[PDB]
A paper describes a structure:
The N-terminal (NT) domain of spider silk proteins (spidroins) is crucial for their storage at high concentrations and also regulates silk assembly. NTs from the major ampullate spidroin (MaSp) and the minor ampullate spidroin are monomeric at neutral pH and confer solubility to spidroins, whereas at lower pH, they dimerize to interconnect spidroins in a fiber. Here, we determine the solution and crystal structures of the flagelliform spidroin NT, which shares only 35% identity with MaSp NT, and investigate the mechanisms of its dimerization. However, the protonation events involve a different set of residues than in MaSp, indicating that an overall mechanism of pH-dependent dimerization is conserved but can be mediated by different pathways in different silk types.
The X-ray crystal structure of [name] NT dimer was also solved and contained a single dimer in crystallographic asymmetric unit. The model could be built for most of the protein, excluding NT residues 1 to 9 in subunit A and 1 to 11 in subunit B, C-terminal residue of subunit A and loop, including residues 55 to 59 of subunit A. All the obtained structures were compared to WT MaSp NT in order to determine the overall structural similarity and to identify structural differences for the key residues. The high-resolution X-ray structure reveals more details on pH-dependent interactions between acidic residues of monomers. The most obvious such interaction occurs among Asp 122 and Glu 130 of both subunits. This interaction is possible only at low pH and requires that at least one of the acidic residues—presumably Glu 130—is protonated. Another notable contact occurs among Glu 84 and Asp 41 of the same subunit, described previously as “handshake interaction” in MaSp NT. This interaction in turn may alter the relative placement of α-helices and favor necessary interactions between monomers, such as salt bridge formation among Glu 40 and Arg 59 of the other subunit. However, this salt bridge is present only in one side of the dimer, since the loop, including Arg 59 is disordered in the other monomer of our crystal structure. The intersubunit salt bridge formed between Asp 40 and Lys 65 in MaSp NT is also present between Asp 41 and Lys 65 in [name] NT and an additional interaction between Asp 44 and Lys 65 was identified. Based on the X-ray structure of [name] NT, Glu 130 was identified as a promising candidate as its protonation would favor dimer formation by alleviating the electrostatic repulsions with negatively charged residues present at the dimer interface, and this supposition agrees with major chemical shift changes of Gln 131 upon dimerization of [name] NT.
Residue numbers in the entry:
A (entry chain A): 10 to 54, 60 to 134
B (entry chain B): 11 to 135
Write the structure that this text describes.
Amino acid sequence: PFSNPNTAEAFARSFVSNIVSSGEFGAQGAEDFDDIIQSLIQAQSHDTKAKAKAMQVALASSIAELVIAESSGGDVQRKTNVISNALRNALMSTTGSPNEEFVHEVQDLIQMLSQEQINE
Amino acid sequence: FSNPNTAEAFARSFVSNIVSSGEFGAQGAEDFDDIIQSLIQAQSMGKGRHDTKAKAKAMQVALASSIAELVIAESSGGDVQRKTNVISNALRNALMSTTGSPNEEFVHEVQDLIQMLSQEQINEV
């Protein structure tokens, strides 16, 4: 989905809409996701495979870190399931595919970052 | 990384340290430069209407993960410990030079991300 800058723009709009609709995040939380995803999508703009991988991981890691920073510890599993659902749905509606690898990366990153000193 | 003037200087110093290490070739150094410059622009843009502590953490993690992923991408699996040591040393010197702390929390984040990303399907060869 991060092939086309227009597909990327369309995925971002759809993901943030899925976050707003969940009822799990307030005004500021949905805005946090929007500011961060919009920034990284815009940055993702000659390409190498290595650079594409770095940008895909930067986006996955930014989403994972927001889940932790928005959560209060005990609700990380609930917010992980809500963000996983929002992601799967936006990918499926914008691409016809659920991009399970991208979702796996975000889930793995959420679990690793729940233990980093930046989040202690 | 909240101070644009510092951010830019850190980018230049870090990339200089990567080039001087001799551990990364010309393409590697180019990939690092392009990615670190994009993530600085992202750090500024990520402030949007009102900067928040949660957004600042998300953008520091995005920068750390982008560095960790290129370490994996620029090798092909084998020499990960040497490259982790060289990148950690390049980062510490660039942080000390531009801030006067080694910011070992940020460096540890990058070392943890190298460990975890070296497991992921995107990195399978």
